[PDB]
A and B are shown apart, each in its own frame.
Chain A
Amino acid sequence: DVKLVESGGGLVKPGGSLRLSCAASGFTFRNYGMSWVRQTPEKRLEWVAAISGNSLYTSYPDSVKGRFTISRDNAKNNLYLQMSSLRSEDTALYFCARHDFFDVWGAGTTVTASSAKTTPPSVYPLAPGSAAQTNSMVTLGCLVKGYFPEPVTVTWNSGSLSSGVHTFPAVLQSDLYTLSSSVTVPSSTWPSETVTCNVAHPASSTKVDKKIVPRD
């Protein structure tokens, strides 16, 4: 099992610093060139830095030269990316990748560079408009509003209610994220059986459980 595991991704203010790590296993690390490749929120992939197996040779695109420094500790099976004087343009998912043109990629670690402040979400329940309606199925929801940074985690009934759910991508409206999640159940099972959405926002160290009750 050849593995690359990234870590060290966080929220940084513009002008701030961050060091990412990439732990490798399943191969002789010093034998392979390594790169960092970022994926932007628009999902463009961008090659960011490369280093030789032996550590002696490095390259960078001009857009990161003098800001980012790639290194490796072969004795530790670790690749590093030291990022400094960060701007919002650097906000991305940062992948660690191995040269054969990258045949092995890590899962990535998220970096976000922003002057916007860490903010817990407000969680609002979405119960059907007061009129009792109607068919076999009832759609309920939770509205998760005004948090920063990403991500949030949304579950239903602690994860035991997994079928029939749509959790939508967050949208950024002036410094803050809003997301919603829908769940559809047999109309016979609600409100007789409780439906609760659980929202976690690790950045703010917050969890909120919001039981969906019929409105009056």
Chain B
Amino acid sequence: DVLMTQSPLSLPVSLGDQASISCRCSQSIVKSNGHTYLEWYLQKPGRSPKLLIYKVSNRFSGVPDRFSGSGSGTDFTLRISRVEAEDLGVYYCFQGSHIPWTFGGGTKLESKRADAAPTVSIFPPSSEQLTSGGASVVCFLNNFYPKDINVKWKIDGSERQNGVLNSWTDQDSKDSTYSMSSTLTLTKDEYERHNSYTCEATHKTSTSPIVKSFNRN
């Protein structure tokens, strides 16, 4: 198998700037007929992949001039001169030169915007979840930038890293922010043994730690 390796994994770009994505192959993708069937696909979330470039350098019908491909040996490059919002998504390289046909792992093209502090909301376990013997504490950190944010839970002032599940949305199309959900799941008994539950939002240099708390009473 030709292994296809893409870099970078993610690429934040300002709208209207240049982007370039690299794709390396573990071996020659020159087919015996002399041609190199290196393709680029764009996959937007909710959608299926779309063909942009075929045979290293040829723009597929309808694809704007801002997309171009280069490369030859084991290294291939897609450049986008002047990225627009419609260009955002996951780019995959693909070789159709040798069976089995193989894809690169994808490169996520993202828009840059001004840094935005999250809106933080904390929620106690509902009464309904307690009747069933469970207790999840839910924290929303909504509409922030950049993607990498640090969430810390504290129980009565002591950090808890263990029973927590985080999930991140795809970059918002309208405002270019990310949102995150953080869930601390505990048993009802464990929950009833403690009082202060706190969800904390930070970077690592951000001098604004946003703390939200409740006391169960």
Contacts and interface: CB of A to CB of B under 8 A. Distances in A.
Contacts, number: 130
A168 B179 CA distance: 8
A139 interface: yes
A55 to B, nearest CB: 18
Given A101-B39, A103-B51, A124-B128, A43 B106 contact: yes
B106 A61 contact: no
Given A47-B101, A180-B181, A141 B123 contact: yes
Contacts of B41: 102
Contacts of A46: 103
Contacts of A95: 48-49
A171 interface: yes
B127 A215 contact: yes
Interface residues of B, number: 49
B21 to A, nearest CB: 15
A30 B129 CA distance: 56
12 contacts: A43-B106, A62-B100, A101-B51, A102-B39, A102-B49, A105-B48, A105-B50, A107-B48, A124-B125, A124-B126, A128-B123, A129-B123
Interface of B: 1, 37, 39, 41, 47-51, 54, 60, 90, 92, 94, 96, 99-103, 105-106, 119, 121-129, 132, 134, 136, 138, 140, 142, 165-169, 179-181, 183, 185, 214
Interface of A: 35, 43-47, 50, 59, 61-62, 95, 100-103, 105-108, 122, 124-131, 137, 139, 141, 143, 145, 166-171, 173, 178-180, 182, 184, 215
